[PDB]
Design an enzyme around this catalytic site. Structure first.
Site, PDB file in Angstrom:
ATOM      1  N   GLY B   9     128.388  51.314-132.266  1.00 39.40           N
ATOM      2  CA  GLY B   9     129.245  50.145-132.257  1.00 39.40           C
ATOM      3  C   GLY B   9     130.134  50.115-133.483  1.00 39.40           C
ATOM      4  N   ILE B  11     129.384  48.967-137.126  1.00 41.29           N
ATOM      5  CA  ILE B  11     128.777  49.490-138.346  1.00 41.29           C
ATOM      6  C   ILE B  11     128.183  50.881-138.114  1.00 41.29           C
ATOM      7  CG2 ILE B  11     126.398  48.616-138.072  1.00 41.29           C
ATOM      8  CD1 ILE B  11     128.596  48.367-141.256  1.00 41.29           C
ATOM      9  N   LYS B 180     118.824  38.299-146.745  1.00 39.73           N
ATOM     10  CA  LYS B 180     119.972  38.391-145.854  1.00 39.73           C
ATOM     11  C   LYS B 180     119.779  37.506-144.627  1.00 39.73           C
ATOM     12  CE  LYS B 180     123.927  39.885-144.364  1.00 39.73           C
ATOM     13  NZ  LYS B 180     125.177  39.411-145.021  1.00 39.73           N
ATOM     14  N   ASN B 249     132.051  33.723-139.440  1.00 45.11           N
ATOM     15  CA  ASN B 249     130.796  34.463-139.345  1.00 45.11           C
ATOM     16  C   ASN B 249     130.670  35.206-138.016  1.00 45.11           C
ATOM     17  OD1 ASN B 249     128.795  32.801-137.417  1.00 45.11           O
ATOM     18  ND2 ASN B 249     130.051  31.349-138.581  1.00 45.11           N
ATOM     19  N   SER B 250     129.818  36.227-137.992  1.00 51.24           N
ATOM     20  CA  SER B 250     129.714  37.124-136.843  1.00 51.24           C
ATOM     21  C   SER B 250     129.230  36.415-135.581  1.00 51.24           C
ATOM     22  CB  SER B 250     128.780  38.294-137.169  1.00 51.24           C
ATOM     23  OG  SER B 250     127.499  37.837-137.566  1.00 51.24           O
ATOM     24  N   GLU B 262     122.661  36.875-132.236  1.00 47.96           N
ATOM     25  CA  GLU B 262     121.404  37.380-132.784  1.00 47.96           C
ATOM     26  C   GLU B 262     120.549  36.280-133.406  1.00 47.96           C
ATOM     27  OE1 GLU B 262     121.607  41.728-134.482  1.00 47.96           O
ATOM     28  OE2 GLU B 262     123.379  40.658-135.210  1.00 47.96           O
TER      29      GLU B 262
END
Ligand SMILES: NC(=O)c1ccc[n+]([C@@H]2O[C@H](COP(=O)([O-])OP(=O)(O)OC[C@H]3O[C@@H](n4cnc5c(N)ncnc54)[C@H](OP(=O)(O)O)[C@@H]3O)[C@@H](O)[C@H]2O)c1
Ligand SMILES: NC(=O)c1ccc[n+]([C@@H]2O[C@H](COP(=O)([O-])OP(=O)(O)OC[C@H]3O[C@@H](n4cnc5c(N)ncnc54)[C@H](OP(=O)(O)O)[C@@H]3O)[C@@H](O)[C@H]2O)c1
Lengths: 298, 297
Positions: B9, B11, B180, B249-250, B262
């Site tokens: 994908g 990354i 994280k 944000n993602s 996620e």
């Protein structure tokens, strides 16, 4: 009965007009727009019922003590309003709050021990100056604040019922104020944050569960404050949701109209009292911050 | 070093291409559109730096064990991915997860003791098949999961550093995964709910304070699981926010694209471990429910 309604907004104009039809001496206190509109073309109620009355309207609370003073401003205006109207509070004048949020009755108690708390399921929306929409009919519960009873409370309930305002008397008014406040915390919290109709909050199982969580947070806060419930706020929650499936909550509407919300007196007060008894109540605080932050980005 | 990247994908293509450029034996494993694009016209990197490499690409992990297998799939696919690529996990094959969320390394440990956890601040976005945007440069932190160290970990870090991937080694990888994860709870929570850029969460003082509250909720959850932090997560939170002020944000991006999020492995995992250790995570739970409700709407 001589009745002053401090705050000729939506529910204030509804109650005021309903009381006016019955033949009561009603004086509405509100904005200059509302006052002028009513003084020249009267007050028009439409929707659930349709009629036109001409109650007295003014921007200043008359210096002649009424039998009843009804607090119908939003919670963020109560304290100033009281100061602006204290000249009308006579020795026997009772103060009735039909407002949402918490702390209004305590603010009223600073002027007189004759204070009663109230909650209404009636829906009202002032669509135009001098024009109010009776969106829906609902039951009204009033009672001597915080608890107990009085003959004049029964009389007020009688005048209301006569006036077409379905009213029952409670001896646990503070419990009703808190129950309504918790229900409102859930609905005006989640519903506003997600921008969905009320029914959605029960239909989504996760939203239902988190609604339950918020509700028991508020309930534990209330019970540690020595407040018990005649009717548990969850039953009132699912009931209220059932009655307002097609409605967007009033707070979300406030954000939509660019108006100020009452969440400082809903979630904010719950958080405040929670802190007052050594608790914290995370969910109400997060909802408070989220709603306020959403309001900020108009 | 022989490296298979499972999940070609964003990354995954970034790391894979960088490692391929460095001269490593790199194999990308993903969806075919990507595989065909790379096999027919190669892999193109643009943005922070621009170059073109052509590593090996396939849809199924080769039955020959690589030195390193990099997990670059989304957290909701890890298990499945692991089952579909299990044949390449040899005795000396190490598994490195650079995914967000929690539990990935634990999923990897079911196949091999050779597992290392990793977190990267690098930004990557697959805009087209065979093309990846290097949105931003950031530090990468890897370490033997959950704690301790190993020579092969140092070697992997050396390969990364030579590949242009700024990388440091930690002796508390699980602590980094959790840090994280907490930061992501705050950012992907508040930022997604209010639909605002990351920097906003610090511009509004109230959002900042409530961010502190959420973060310490996560921190107490982490603290009862016996996990300590090399650097405090709140410091890492504002660090991340200033480094990513203009970015949505993602999770919010995913919702805007209608993609799956996620948060089940971010807020969801935090709530899970909290209940598993006899606690409550009200803020994380409420945020979880709100976000999960927001994708549908
Ligand atoms: N609307 C409903 O159907 C309903 C139902 C149940 C409960 N309630 C509760 O009843 C309360 C009133 O709600 P609402 O919908 O009627 O809002 P509203 O339409 O804004 O009514 C408040 C009115 O009172 C005015 N006001 C504020 N301070 C005043 C003062 N010193 N003197 C004279 N007027 C003053 C306000 O003017 P400004 O705007 O210029 O301040 C406003 O016009 C709320 O707490 C609500 O939660 C409402
Ligand atoms: N994007 C970033 O900049 C970044 C930075 C740091 C960390 N991360 C984390 O890394 C993980 C993925 O990030 P991402 O942005 O690269 O997501 P991504 O673009 O969706 O890449 C994941 C790829 O792996 C594919 N995939 C899923 N199962 C597979 C399987 N068995 N075999 C082969 N391919 C499979 C996926 O295909 P399908 O979509 O069809 O399932 C997808 O193409 C996340 O945990 C993320 O939090 C991302």
């Amino acid at each position: 009965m001589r009745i002053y309604v401090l705050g000729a907004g939506s529910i204030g104009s509804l109650f005021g007009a309903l009381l006016a039809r019955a033949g009561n001496d009603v004086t509405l206190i509100g904005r200059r727009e509302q006052v002028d509109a009513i003084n020249k073309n009267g007050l028009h109620v439409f929707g659930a019922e349709e009629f036109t009355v001409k109650p007295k309207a003014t921007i200043y609370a008359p210096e002649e003590p009424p039998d009843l003073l009804i607090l119908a401003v939003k919670s963020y205006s109560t304290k100033t309003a009281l100061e602006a109207a204290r000249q009308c509070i006579g020795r026997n004048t009772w103060v009735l709050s039909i407002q949402n949020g918490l702390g209004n009755e305590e603010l009223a108690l600073k002027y007189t021990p004759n204070v009663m708390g109230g909650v209404t399921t009636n829906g009202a929306m002032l669509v135009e100056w001098g024009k109010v929409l009776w969106a829906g009919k609902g039951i009204t519960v009033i009672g001597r604040y915080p608890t107990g009873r009085d003959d004049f409370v029964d009389e007020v309930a009688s005048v209301f019922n006569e006036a077409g305002i379905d009213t029952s008397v409670t001896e646990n008014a503070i419990g009703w104020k808190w129950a309504k406040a918790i229900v409102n915390s859930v609905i005006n919290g989640l519903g506003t944050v997600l921008e969905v109709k009320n029914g959605h909050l029960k239909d989504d199982p996760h939203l239902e569960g988190i609604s339950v969580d918020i509700a028991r947070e508020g309930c534990m806060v209330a019970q540690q404050l020595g407040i018990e419930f005649e009717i548990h706020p969850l039953e009132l929650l699912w009931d209220t949701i059932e009655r307002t499936r097609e409605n967007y909550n009033s707070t979300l509407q406030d954000i939509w109209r660019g108006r100020e919300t009452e969440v400082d007196y809903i979630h904010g007060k719950i958080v405040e009292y929670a802190r007052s008894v050594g608790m914290e109540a995370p969910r109400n605080e997060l909802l408070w911050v989220l709603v306020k932050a959403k309001e900020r980005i108009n």
